């Protein structure tokens, strides 16, 4: 997260930190709780990830230093990637994680409502990623208010990339506030009528918070059907 501020403990209940044990443990990507045993995130986060067994999910986290070898975590029973995914920059950068055990909701971990298809503004991108292109994972969960930018507006900034309707861009004309390396998979949460909705999944972008370079996110509303299909028994 570039140009943001440290969050408060429990400020973003759905946000979780995904770790990989190979070759050694470390933050891998962001993620959103959306059900007892369902974590939503970006598909590109599992490039070269063979077994779901190397994945460890931590919810209710504020600071990475809350995580040590003796720290509890939810095991990942299954990794479901969208059958059309290929490159994050081509779309379908969405994936589901089915946790080994059910999640007990508390003040520090609750799910986030999926946007209503009937809805095809007050948005924030959160994460523990870089503060600038070259940097390091942040200990304290970062957050930043970013305005959504139309696709026609996005396409222009990306004359080399084709921004479909399954994508949505957010950023500032001037930059300065955007997600960066390590925020991937993480949520773009927007609040309407004081109800949060998972509008986007951090996906890609040229650099971080650069002028006229909106961050490209997966447009979640375009996948709820896919989601209900995968979450179903
Ligand atoms: C995620 O946090 C990560 N996914 C995997 C590792 S880190 C970032 C979020 C990017 C948000 N950007 C923004 N709002 N400005 N995603 C990526 O790094 C993805 N790639 C890219 O965003 C860009 C796309 C491009 N056309 O350049 N690629 C890129 O930065 N590539 C270089 C090679 C790179 C440098 C450092 C790191 Br840690 C990764 C890649 C994924 C790689 C698809």
Swiss-Prot record:
Transmembrane segments: none annotated. The active site is at 44 (charge relay system), 93 (charge relay system), 184 (charge relay system). Changing residue 119 to G: In FA11D; mild phenotype. Heparin binds at residues 156-159. Residues 1-232 form the Peptidase S1 domain. Glycans are attached at residues 63, 104. Disulfide bonds join 29-45, 123-190, 154-169, 180-208. This is Coagulation factor XIa light chain. It comes from Homo sapiens. The lineage of its organism: Eukaryota, Metazoa, Chordata, Craniata, Vertebrata.
């Amino acid at each position: 997260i570039v140009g943001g501020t440290a969050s408060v403990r429990g400020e973003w209940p759905w946000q979780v930190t995904l770790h990989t044990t190979s070759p050694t443990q470390r933050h891998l990507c962001g993620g959103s709780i959306i059900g007892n045993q369902w974590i939503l995130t970006a598909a590109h986060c599992f490039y070269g990830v063979e077994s779901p067994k190397i994945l460890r999910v931590y919810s209710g986290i504020l600071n990475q230093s809350e995580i040590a070898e003796d720290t509890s975590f939810f095991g990942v029973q299954e990794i479901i990637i969208h059958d059309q995914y290929k490159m994050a920059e081509s779309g379908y950068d969405i994936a589901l994680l089915k946790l080994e055990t059910t999640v007990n909701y508390t003040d520090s971990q609750r799910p986030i409502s999926l946007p209503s298809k009937g809805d095809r503004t007050d948005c924030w991108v959160t994460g523990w990623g870089y503060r600038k292109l070259r940097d390091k994972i942040q200990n304290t969960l970062q957050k930043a208010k970013i305005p959504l930018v139309t696709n026609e507006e996005c396409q222009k900034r990306y004359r080399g990339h084709k921004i479909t309707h399954k994508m949505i861009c957010a950023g500032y004309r001037e930059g300065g506030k955007d997600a960066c390396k390590g925020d991937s998979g993480g949520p773009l949460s927007c609040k309407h009528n004081e109800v949060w909705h998972l509008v986007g999944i951090t996906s890609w972008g040229e650099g971080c918070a650069q002028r006229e370079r909106p961050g490209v996110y997966t447009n979640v509303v375009e996948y709820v059907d896919w989601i209900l299909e995968k979450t179903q028994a």
